[PDB]
Amino acid sequence: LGQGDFIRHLMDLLKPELVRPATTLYQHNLTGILETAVRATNAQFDSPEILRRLDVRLLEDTGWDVFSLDYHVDGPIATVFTRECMSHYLRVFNFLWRAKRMEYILTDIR
Amino acid sequence: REIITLQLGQCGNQIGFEFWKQLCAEHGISPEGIVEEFTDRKDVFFYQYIPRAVLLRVIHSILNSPYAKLYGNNWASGFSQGEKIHEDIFDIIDREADGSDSLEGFVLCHSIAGTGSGLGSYLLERLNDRYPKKLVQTYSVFPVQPYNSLLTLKRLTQNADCVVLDNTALNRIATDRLHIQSFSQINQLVSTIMSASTTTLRYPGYMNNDLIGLIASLIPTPRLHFLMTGYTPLTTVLDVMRRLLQPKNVMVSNHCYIAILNIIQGEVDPTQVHKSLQRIRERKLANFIPWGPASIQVALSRKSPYLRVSGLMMANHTSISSLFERTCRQYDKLRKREDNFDEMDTSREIVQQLIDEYHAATRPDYIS
Amino acid sequence: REIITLQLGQCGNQIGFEFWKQLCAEHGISPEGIVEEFTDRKDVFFYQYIPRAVLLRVIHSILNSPYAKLYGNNWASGFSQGEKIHEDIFDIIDREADGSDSLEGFVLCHSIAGTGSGLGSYLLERLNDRYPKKLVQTYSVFPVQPYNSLLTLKRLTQNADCVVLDNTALNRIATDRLHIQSFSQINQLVSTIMSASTTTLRYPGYMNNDLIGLIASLIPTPRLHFLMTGYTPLTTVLDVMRRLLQPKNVMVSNHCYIAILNIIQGEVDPTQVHKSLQRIRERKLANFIPWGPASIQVALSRKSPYLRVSGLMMANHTSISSLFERTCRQYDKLRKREDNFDEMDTSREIVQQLIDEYHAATRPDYIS
Amino acid sequence: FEATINKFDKNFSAHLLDLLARLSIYSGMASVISRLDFNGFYTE
Structure with a gap:
């Protein structure tokens, strides 16, 4: 979440979707929303290569409990991350996602 | 999200024009609205580049300047004329709001002293x-x-x-450390604050990426919505954090703070920030409200490469009530010196409520 | 397949003559109808080369020009005179249609404002x-x-x-970005659209190789057969696709589209086209009919080597009904201000049916 | 004739909701739905 500008727009577009239960959620729909955010925010001016790996994954309730980004990496660069950094980032990304919706709720009440 | 800015009166257009001149240089945008060759988020204020501005005699000075490729004295007269062109000026905003991707706000630049005072009050209600x-x-x-x-x-x-940005504190700082004795010289100081006020909306940061993030942090209650500014460099973060709490820099002519926001626009060390806040708590340089738990917030930023350590302070101080009494007291002296004239006392009534609202905010039992 | 073009009235001959001048240059055909030395399909419009044209005072200006080697004001007078020469003018078309390999259509270039208005209405029935x-x-x-x-x-x-190509939107664009203040100057703009309208019938493409391919795609129902044009450059496909949806470019003085056709005449990248359409769906810059499934179509083309990125938009917009009310409303004002005069109200009756047909097309239950 | 046109509608629309169904379950092959639908139709 070090970008901030991109995650702001991404939390405004997933609001109408994640409120529904997880059973009606299918991954093929959210990708069009993520792709829309990367186009509108400042993340468009970015290396096309790294943007090819950034996608969504569905953890396996409510839409605010199974959504998370993945950024899969394979090849030579995969010897630095080694399937454990990707099992640690997602362990972190939840705590930064919760502490981000618990704030945009409290600026909506305000 | 986007933000459309409105400029009213002679004061608005100038400090607005100086605001866009400072921002167009911060970014790699030439005065003819063409990107120069030479990462900064510029979609909030600029429309793919053209500024999202709505200007409202002084206009000719802007049209003759090199920046042409970038686009009475009674309050009753200002309020009346806005009523007559209600549909006209509301037709350029509607398209400006609709045509926008997802509108967020309406930044307004005006002075309360003649037409911008009235026409400004009119648009604020509509x-x-x-x-x-x-x-x-x-x-x-x-x-x-x-x-x-x-x-x-x-x-x-x-x-x-x-x-608030009061000209009295602008004149004092001008003669003190700038030696002006001029409108074109004080405007260089206000525009430095404006371009620094939204330095967390032009660069993708960790927190404060939305306009509602800067607002809801400071304003605890919708009545207490007046903030003041502090800007020191006209070195460690402890030096800047101490110089900002000096009343010689606060642009305002018991009493305590409600919440402070510090903006550090330098390349300072990111681990020493907690060390400075610790020494602030020991020496006790700032006092806050006794009722609710209030803290101080500090945020770092990155200066544009195309365009040193600076620092700005955004705080919600109860001392701002003093300014209102000065305006309030002068009115009563004029009310005894000279269709119904009932709109004034209603305004006089509601402003007194805010003043008492402030003085009751500094008590250990402000609730109810 | 072939297409024979008919030009009626002063407006037809000029914008037709400027249409052939632009096309003869696009191809390697000298003004004296001889191929110059210096892959483009030219058999549809030219007969092995001579244009398949039927022109109908202004003729002398064409005969004196270097292109000589290439071949009242009441509506009742225009309709009457066509009845008298019915067999004469229908003798040059019959041979033009028969002599043709396999006729396909009858392009007609005329203005509804005096003889081309009547004589045009007469040939359309015959x-x-x-x-x-x-x-x-x-x-x-x-x-x-x-x-x-x-x-x-x-x-x-x-x-x-x-x-439709309305002169009002032609005058506005002329004074805005062309600075004309002239008939010979607006014609340069319409002929640029015509030569671009049939840019998918002069070059062998993947799809839209027949005139019935461009028509049946847009027109859903034989009553709703009015289209408008958009032409931006007077860079990626996203820039062109966004500039075409700006009402500042649409040549027309709730409401939604029925189908859009985009023509890209450049060397643009063929894989980024789907990426632009995706961002169009997200930002939601265009709204369509709610009843039937409507999509937007974009087709690429190749510019002639003998003769940069351009773009044209063909769409079927329900807002075209507004133009008819302007013509309809002005009539009733004239009907109260002055053999049987019954032909007018029948025309007045049938045009009102189309207007109601349009306003009912933008409802979620347009069917029946 | 008047009674068979409505049969084709129930027959053809049934196969199309099958095509849009299988073309959705994929990991292109996902941008086809944005080429079949544009108006949010077939949302059932």
Whole structure:
């Protein structure tokens, strides 16, 4: 979440979707929303290569409990991350996602 | 999200024009609205580049300047003329709001001292009625003058969702460390604050990526929505954090803070920030409200490569009530010296409520 | 397949002559109808080379020009004189249609404002009666003037199988970005659209290789057969696709689209086209009919080597009904201000049916 | 004739909701739905 500008727009577009239960959620729909955010925010001016790996994954309730980004990496660069950094980032990304919706709720009440 | 800025009166257009000149240089945008060759988020203010501005005699000075490729004195006269062109000026905003991707706010740059005082109060009522989900932040500037000063104060206390810049503290700082003795010289100082006020909306940061993030942090209650600014460099973060709490720099002519926001626009060390806050708590340089738990917030930023350590302070100080009494007291002296004239006392009534609201905020039992 | 073009009235001959001048240069064909030395399909419009044209005072200006080697004001007078020379002018078309390999259509270039208004309405009735399998596409041009304007509208709503170009939007664009203040200067803009309208019939493409391919895609129902044009460059495909949806470029003085066709005449990248359409769906810059599934179509093309990125938009917008009310309303004002005079109200009756047909098309239950 | 046109509608629309169904379950092959639908139709 070090970008901030991109995650702001991404939390405004997933609001109408994640409120529904997880059973009606299918991954093929959210990708069009993520792709829309990367186009509108400042993340468009970015290396096309790294943007090819950034996608969504569905953890396996409510839409605010199974959504998370993945950024899969394979090849030579995969010897630095080694399937454990990707099992640690997602362990972190939840705590930064919760502490981000618990704030945009409290600026909506305000 | 986007933000459309409105400039009213002679004061608005100039400090607005100096605001765009400073921002167009911060970014790699030439005065003819063409990107120069030579990462900074520029979609909030610029439309793919053209500024999202709505300007409202002084216009000719802007049209003759090299930046042409970039686009009475009674309060009653200002309020009346806005009523006559209601549909005209509301036709350029509607398309400006609709054509926008997802509108967020309405930054307003005006001075409460003649037409911008009235026409400004008029648009402030129409804006809230037309859209109730759109934030209206107003960069008002403090100076028949006592009358028009408090009349807009009535509208600014219920309509505007959120920054005062008083010319008196501008004149004092001008003669002290700038040696001016001039309008074109004080404007260089205010525009330095404006371009620094939204330095967390032009660069993708960790927190404060939305306009509602800067507002809801400081303003605890929708009545107490007046903030002041502090800007020191006219070195460690402890030096900047101490110089900002000096009343020689606060641009305002018991009492305590409600919440402070510090903006550090330098390349400072990111681990020493907690060390400075620790020494602030020990020496006790700032006092806060006793009722609610209040803290101080500090945020770092990155200066544009195309365009040293600076620092800005955004705080919600209860001492701002003092400024209102000066405007309030002068009115009563004029009310005994000279269709119904009932709109004034209603404004006089509601402004007194805010003043008592402030003085009751510094008590250990402000609740109820 | 072939297409024979008919030019009626002063407006037709000029914008037709400028149409052939632009096309003869696009191809390697010298003004004296000889191929110059210096892959483009030229058999549809040219006969092995001579244009398949039927011109109908202004003729002398064409005969004196270097292109000589290439071949009242009442609507009742225009309709009457066509009845007298019915067999004469129908003898040059018959041989032009027969002599053709396999006729496909009848492009018509005329303005509804005096003889081309009447004589144009007359040929439109005879054409459908003589041949029911031949498409009649009419490049009408909008301006006793209110009368003749709607009379042809009666014929254009049941005879013509398919493009409006209104002079008002031509004058506005002329003074805005061309600085004309002239007939010879606006014609340079319309002919740029015509030569670009059939850019998918002069080059062998993947799809839209026939005139019935461009028509049946847009027109969903034979009553809703009025289209408008958009042409931006007077860079990626996203820039062009966004600039075409700006009402500052649409040549037309709730409401939604029925189908859009985008023509890209550049060397643009063929894989980024789907990426642009994706961002169009997200930002939601265009709204369509709610009843039937409507999509947007974009087609690429190749510019002639003998003769940069351009773009044209063909769409079927329900807002075109607004233009008809302007013509309709002005008539009723003239009907109260002054053999049987019953032909007018019948025309007035049928045009009102189309207007209600349009306003009912933008409802979620347009069917029945 | 008047009674068979409505049969084709129930027959053809049934196969199309099958095509849009299988073309959705994929990991292009996902941008086809944005080419079949544009108006949010077939949302059932």
